[PDB]
Amino acid sequence: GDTLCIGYHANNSTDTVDTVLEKNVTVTHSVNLLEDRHNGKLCKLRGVAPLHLGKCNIAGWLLGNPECESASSWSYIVETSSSDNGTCYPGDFINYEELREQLSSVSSFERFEIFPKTSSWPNHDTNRGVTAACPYAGAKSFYRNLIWLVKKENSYPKLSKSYINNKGKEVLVLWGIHHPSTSADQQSLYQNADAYVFVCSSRYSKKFKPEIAACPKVRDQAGRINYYWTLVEPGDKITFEATGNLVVPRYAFAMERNSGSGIIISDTSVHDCNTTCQTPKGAINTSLPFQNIHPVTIGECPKYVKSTKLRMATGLRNVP
Amino acid sequence: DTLCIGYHANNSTDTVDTVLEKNVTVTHSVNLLEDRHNGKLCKLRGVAPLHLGKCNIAGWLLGNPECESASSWSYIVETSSSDNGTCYPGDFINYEELREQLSSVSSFERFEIFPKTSSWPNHDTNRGVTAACPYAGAKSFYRNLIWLVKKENSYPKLSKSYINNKGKEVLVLWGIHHPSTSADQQSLYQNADAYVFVCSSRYSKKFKPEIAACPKVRDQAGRINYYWTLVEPGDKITFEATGNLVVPRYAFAMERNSGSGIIISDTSVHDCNTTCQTPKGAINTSLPFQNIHPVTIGECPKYVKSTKLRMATGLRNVPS
Amino acid sequence: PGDTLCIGYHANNSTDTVDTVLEKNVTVTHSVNLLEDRHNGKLCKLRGVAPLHLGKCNIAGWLLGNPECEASSWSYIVETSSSDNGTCYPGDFINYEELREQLSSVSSFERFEIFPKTSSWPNHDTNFYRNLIWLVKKENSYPKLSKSYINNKGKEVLVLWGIHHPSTSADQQSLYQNADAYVFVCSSRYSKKFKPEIAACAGRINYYWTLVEPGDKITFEATGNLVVPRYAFAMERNSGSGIIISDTSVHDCNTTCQTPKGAINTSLPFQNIHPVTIGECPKYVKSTKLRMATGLRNVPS
Amino acid sequence: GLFGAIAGFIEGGWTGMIDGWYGYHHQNEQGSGYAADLKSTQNAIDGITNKVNSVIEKMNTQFIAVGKEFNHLEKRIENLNKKVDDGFLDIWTYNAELLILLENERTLDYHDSNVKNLYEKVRSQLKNNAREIGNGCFEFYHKCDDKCMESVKNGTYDYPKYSEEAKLNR
Amino acid sequence: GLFGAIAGFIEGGWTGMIDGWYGYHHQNEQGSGYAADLKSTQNAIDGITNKVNSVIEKMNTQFIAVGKEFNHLEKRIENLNKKVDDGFLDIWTYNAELLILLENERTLDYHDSNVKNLYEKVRSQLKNNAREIGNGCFEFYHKCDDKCMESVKNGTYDYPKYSEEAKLNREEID
Amino acid sequence: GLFGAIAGFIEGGWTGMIDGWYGYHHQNEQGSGYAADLKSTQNAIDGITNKVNSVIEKMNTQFIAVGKEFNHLEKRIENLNKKVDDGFLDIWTYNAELLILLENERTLDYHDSNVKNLYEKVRSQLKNNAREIGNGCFEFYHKCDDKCMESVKNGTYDYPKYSEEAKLNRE
Numbered sequence A: 001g002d003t004l005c006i007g008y009h010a011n012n013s014t015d016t017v018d019t020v021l022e023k024n025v026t027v028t029h030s031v032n033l034l035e036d037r038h039n040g041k042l043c044k045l046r047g048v049a050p051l052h053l054g055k056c057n058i059a060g061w062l063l064g065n066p067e068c069e070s071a072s073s074w075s076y077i078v079e080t081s082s083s084d085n086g087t088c089y090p091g092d093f094i095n096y097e098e099l100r101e102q103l104s105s106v107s108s109f110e111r112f113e114i115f116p117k118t119s120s121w122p123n124h125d126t127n128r129g130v131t132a133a134c135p136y137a138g139a140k141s142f143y144r145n146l147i148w149l150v151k152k153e154n155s156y157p158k159l160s161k162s163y164i165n166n167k168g169k170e171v172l173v174l175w176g177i178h179h180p181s182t183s184a185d186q187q188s189l190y191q192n193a194d195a196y197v198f199v200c201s202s203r204y205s206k207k208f209k210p211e212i213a214a215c216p217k218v219r220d221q222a223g224r225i226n227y228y229w230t231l232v233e234p235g236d237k238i239t240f241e242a243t244g245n246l247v248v249p250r251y252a253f254a255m256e257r258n259s260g261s262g263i264i265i266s267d268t269s270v271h272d273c274n275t276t277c278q279t280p281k282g283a284i285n286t287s288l289p290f291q292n293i294h295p296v297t298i299g300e301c302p303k304y305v306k307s308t309k310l311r312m313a314t315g316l317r318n319v320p
Numbered sequence B: 001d002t003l004c005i006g007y008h009a010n011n012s013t014d015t016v017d018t019v020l021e022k023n024v025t026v027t028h029s030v031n032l033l034e035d036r037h038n039g040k041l042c043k044l045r046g047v048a049p050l051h052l053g054k055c056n057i058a059g060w061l062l063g064n065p066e067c068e069s070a071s072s073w074s075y076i077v078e079t080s081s082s083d084n085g086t087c088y089p090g091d092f093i094n095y096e097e098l099r100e101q102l103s104s105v106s107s108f109e110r111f112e113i114f115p116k117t118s119s120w121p122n123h124d125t126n127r128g129v130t131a132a133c134p135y136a137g138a139k140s141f142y143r144n145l146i147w148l149v150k151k152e153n154s155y156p157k158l159s160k161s162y163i164n165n166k167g168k169e170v171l172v173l174w175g176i177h178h179p180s181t182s183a184d185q186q187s188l189y190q191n192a193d194a195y196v197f198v199c200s201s202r203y204s205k206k207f208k209p210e211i212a213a214c215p216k217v218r219d220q221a222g223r224i225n226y227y228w229t230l231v232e233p234g235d236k237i238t239f240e241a242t243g244n245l246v247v248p249r250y251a252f253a254m255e256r257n258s259g260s261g262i263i264i265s266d267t268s269v270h271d272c273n274t275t276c277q278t279p280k281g282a283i284n285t286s287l288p289f290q291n292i293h294p295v296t297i298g299e300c301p302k303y304v305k306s307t308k309l310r311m312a313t314g315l316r317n318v319p320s
Numbered sequence C: 001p002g003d004t005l006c007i008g009y010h011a012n013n014s015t016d017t018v019d020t021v022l023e024k025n026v027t028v029t030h031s032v033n034l035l036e037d038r039h040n041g042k043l044c045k046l047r048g049v050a051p052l053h054l055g056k057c058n059i060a061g062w063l064l065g066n067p068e069c070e071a072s073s074w075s076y077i078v079e080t081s082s083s084d085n086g087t088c089y090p091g092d093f094i095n096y097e098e099l100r101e102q103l104s105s106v107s108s109f110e111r112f113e114i115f116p117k118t119s120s121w122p123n124h125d126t127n128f129y130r131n132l133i134w135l136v137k138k139e140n141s142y143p144k145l146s147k148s149y150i151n152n153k154g155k156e157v158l159v160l161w162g163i164h165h166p167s168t169s170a171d172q173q174s175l176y177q178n179a180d181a182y183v184f185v186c187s188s189r190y191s192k193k194f195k196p197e198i199a200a201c202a203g204r205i206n207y208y209w210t211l212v213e214p215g216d217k218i219t220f221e222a223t224g225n226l227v228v229p230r231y232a233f234a235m236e237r238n239s240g241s242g243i244i245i246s247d248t249s250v251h252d253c254n255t256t257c258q259t260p261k262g263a264i265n266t267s268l269p270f271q272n273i274h275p276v277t278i279g280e281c282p283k284y285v286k287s288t289k290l291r292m293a294t295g296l297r298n299v300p301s
Numbered sequence D: 001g002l003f004g005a006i007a008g009f010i011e012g013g014w015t016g017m018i019d020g021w022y023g024y025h026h027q028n029e030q031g032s033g034y035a036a037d038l039k040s041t042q043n044a045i046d047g048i049t050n051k052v053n054s055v056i057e058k059m060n061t062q063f064i065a066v067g068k069e070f071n072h073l074e075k076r077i078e079n080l081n082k083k084v085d086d087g088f089l090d091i092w093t094y095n096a097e098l099l100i101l102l103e104n105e106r107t108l109d110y111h112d113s114n115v116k117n118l119y120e121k122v123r124s125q126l127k128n129n130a131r132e133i134g135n136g137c138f139e140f141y142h143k144c145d146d147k148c149m150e151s152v153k154n155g156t157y158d159y160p161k162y163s164e165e166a167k168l169n170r
Numbered sequence E: 001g002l003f004g005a006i007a008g009f010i011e012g013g014w015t016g017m018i019d020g021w022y023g024y025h026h027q028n029e030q031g032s033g034y035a036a037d038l039k040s041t042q043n044a045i046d047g048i049t050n051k052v053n054s055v056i057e058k059m060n061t062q063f064i065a066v067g068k069e070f071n072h073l074e075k076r077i078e079n080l081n082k083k084v085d086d087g088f089l090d091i092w093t094y095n096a097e098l099l100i101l102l103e104n105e106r107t108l109d110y111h112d113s114n115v116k117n118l119y120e121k122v123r124s125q126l127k128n129n130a131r132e133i134g135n136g137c138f139e140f141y142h143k144c145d146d147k148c149m150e151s152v153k154n155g156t157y158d159y160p161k162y163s164e165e166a167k168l169n170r171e172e173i174d
Numbered sequence F: 001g002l003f004g005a006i007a008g009f010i011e012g013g014w015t016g017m018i019d020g021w022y023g024y025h026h027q028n029e030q031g032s033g034y035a036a037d038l039k040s041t042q043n044a045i046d047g048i049t050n051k052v053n054s055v056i057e058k059m060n061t062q063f064i065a066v067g068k069e070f071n072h073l074e075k076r077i078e079n080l081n082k083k084v085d086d087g088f089l090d091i092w093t094y095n096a097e098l099l100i101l102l103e104n105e106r107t108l109d110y111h112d113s114n115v116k117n118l119y120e121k122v123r124s125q126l127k128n129n130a131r132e133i134g135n136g137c138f139e140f141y142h143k144c145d146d147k148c149m150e151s152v153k154n155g156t157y158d159y160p161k162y163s164e165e166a167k168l169n170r171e
């Protein structure tokens, strides 16, 4: 007799999936929700190029370490496992991580001269302030973005220098304080046994006496420099007053607002490419909801998971 | 004859969502998400909040002239802009830690620990006011602080103590004046060298003044720094000053409740009750979720980004 | 006489009760409990290695060498609730909690005399804590001292010292001979200059610590007011360990998992016992009961 | 139609039954009617109210001031705090909506199952004394008065009574 | 029930069948008794075993140094720690309770299903050679001896064989 | 399965039907072949599609620079950050894998339910005019030609027409 049967699809698919009551169930159709593929290289992010600090690190970069060049904007900031050139002179960077967090969000960044080299310091010495910790082509040198002030004649007179903010945004400013290894040196440089420094915006107010001592030489300097920074609002005023022991700003930075950025640590080299998602391991091109690649991502990215596989069954059980 | 079996249907316009199907009309459903709030700032559980007006926590504690002040509360409120501040250019140490301390508490009796008159025979308790911190265009100052001055030209070293014989912690707040010049220092506290020393079973510190003139706010360039400590029962707090001390008058005895909070709200207060209160308004509901506000005090639903959460009780609508 | 064949399902005496969504308290033929409430109420070893029980002293009292205390490694560190620093004097311990969080990260822990008792201090006198020496004047004199250390191991070295603040100038001279005095110490990670703050609230001693990286040198220089390191601690890393606070007693036994309450042997995914645990073991939950149904609905008749 | 009843071989619902979720319609010499089945309906009310009641129960808050204040040097931990609140918020949103979808599906399918099961109850009660016309209607090989219908619905219906009659008529 | 067998048209379970979750009770002149279908049972045992195992295998350990201490000026980040811990704990408790709820329901439905399947399998083997009386039982319109019984049970049932006597004792009624 | 169709009384699938998930295979006087019922298949695809799309939509993320830096006196808050990142990681992984398993099960159950639904649709349609063999097959008690079969498939099948032709053969 004539027959009519009802039945279902089967095919050559060996693709296996997982359910709660049974493991490795071969099914007719499925999708993979997990991207295990990355492009193996650092890329541009949504057009913008990153900023690769190279041997220089954030500190060396903002302080104008001679080994860097000493530009303006970035999608994200990249440091290599070893970023050699540090803070040049042995010393301490105060609230470093905070600062790195402040740059962590921004792309705006106009470096200007807040205290123009020649004009600003009539009674003190601009050019004599080098050190053996900071080579420039083998010579004895210093940072680009800071001016180290010293005796002129035997005179190191009081200085009040004031920058009131005419820009439209926050201005990041750096300076430094020198604590000599000898009262000798102190009187060889700043001429005043007792000296003070102090600085105020409405935000920041502080005063330093040099604390004199020699703790073991780092880069053969037992003296120390402590590097400081602050953000001055617009229409506010930063004021420095020193009878000695002050490394003044030269180029200070102005930061404006677009809301994103970040920092990456990778030895992965920068290639020519573009991606909407970037990890220190490599870049990512996927539409997928999940990624096992790296926990650190930038841009529009899939969620990170410890999963070996995530596979969603679409079709039915496969029974040929 | 016939007997048919079928299901209830109605005019219900309610549609829910399901993995396999979207906008599905159904007979009966419940909204599990509260989109509805009181629209005003209300009471809590019968008892009240504490609303400082244009004053901020700092003001209320120091007794800023424009603050009224008292007793108790369920939770505290500080308006979107709470200005009336430190009215003397200066800095408050550990402001947010203090705020956090208050953030859980209710009872809180403000008393005079070092009564103005009798505590300082050898110092001038009257000349404690500045132009920057006015009253009605005249001069004013904080009511919880006595600013001690020269008696004639003299400023005797003072040692004052307070033992806490109450059962609570006691909040004691003081200040340190950094003058805009030596002229002020020796003109005022009359001792070129001045030192303040505060000793408790936890707090021990010695502030020597740092003189210098940085930017003037509130019309003037002077400086003052506020500090605070919680002193435990059966504990002595000790002050010693040859100068520069702005001194405790009122201290605050603290009865600790494990719950409370601080809300920053422009919204206008009112007479009500409620068990759930939010910056945008109050809340009445048993609904497990709300999209109203992330910040809520009292016993409240989970905050969710969800616009609508609709759960199906009845069955699929097929009216014909 | 119709010759029946029937189809049915199991039922038994089992009273096991489990909750479904739309119905609660359901009796089922079979179930399994996923929530382990059981522990041996002992402090045991962990994957072999015993823990370190600080006894009467707490971390500070331990490191500073409280004499009511008194080896190299541990699985985890244990403090009593009765634990205390062996002080002595009113002073404070600086960045104590950080120091602790650091100790939580270590494992091996060689200790050594950085500044030998006899040899090191010929010009001064020794005035208590074992790991430090309290230096005062010899006869009239407290000479300026400079002492250094370089790292001869491949590990960070924990160095602890202390600073005295006499309650009066009289004390100051009676001890250190110098009314005007400084102490300062720097490694390459560190510099500080402490000068005495003389006041009453006898005497007061503040304690500080630092880690000298391998090859780095540390320097102490004092005209007075110095409690110097006797022993310092060479420490090579684990990335983990842990600090338990428990009054429970330590026994001979092993555990994959330890809690301050006691330890656990269970394959269960969930544990409500204690929020604090060490080793590989269940997620912590506020649940009173999690019981998963295995068999079916029990309907004896 | 997971169980194939609602919008299934039963094409649609009756706007005219206001008395409950599942029920009967009927015809005889004594006329027509919509009478809602009681027991099953109430059982479903129990199941579902226990479903939503339970869903609500399952969420336990702790007494909370989430808000904290961080100064301009606290930016990092300000961001860590933010990351916490946002992470948690995300996860609870996920749980909320997910639960809603899943339990929605299970609910509708539940109704389907109860419908079908009521039907099969009827059918397995009637046997051949009636036949299945489709759209879940039974046609009676015998005559059904209101006591007959009532005997069906209450679950008491007697086959061997109308046995012979139906057998002939069939 | 969802599939309407357990607490369904089969209104009770059998304390008398100890050898499995599902099975048959039979009657005939070579004697009666209980049996369990070892294939359906064993399958369900596999499914549930795997459910459990995959539930306890869905937790991979996150280890740390948890113990953390904060000073009296550390209050804010301390409360941040509290927030983190409490929040994680709430989420996990939630996921647990929810998991056991759902999966319990699904398990019961699973059993109900399996039972139904066994039944309709038997019934669809038989057709009109017997009559379903309800309560998951069948009355044989013909004689079903041991071999016939086990023939239904193992799926080998021959309709044509007894078809005649079935139609005989049947249409005598029909 | 749960609905006992797939890997059920219907033993296996047909490699020979390429046009859909569910369908029929028939023997006739005009000959034989596999053909899929595209309405039930299509609904299946609607559902599965909305399920996957829903899955993907149900996770979408908010903005952070995962880069954060602490020094050696910051260790505590460092380990706290770590605790956060890791805890969240575990939570999400768990959510993912769980969702996947549960929706795979629900999906297979779904296909099964659909097939069973179809078979019951057809069976109910035919009534006694055909006999139920099993393996989801029917043997017709009359002659069902192309038009007849396709009439079954669109659900327009006419019982009255073949009533007698079936009766006689059912004998």
Ligand SMILES: *[C@@H]1O[C@H](CO)[C@@H](O)[C@H](O)[C@H]1NC(C)=O
Pocket: C060, C085, C087, C090, C091, C092, C093, C207
């Ligand atoms: C000893 O403990 C007390 C409180 O228990 C504390 O104030 C003090 O700082 C501690 N001393 C040391 C050396 O840790």
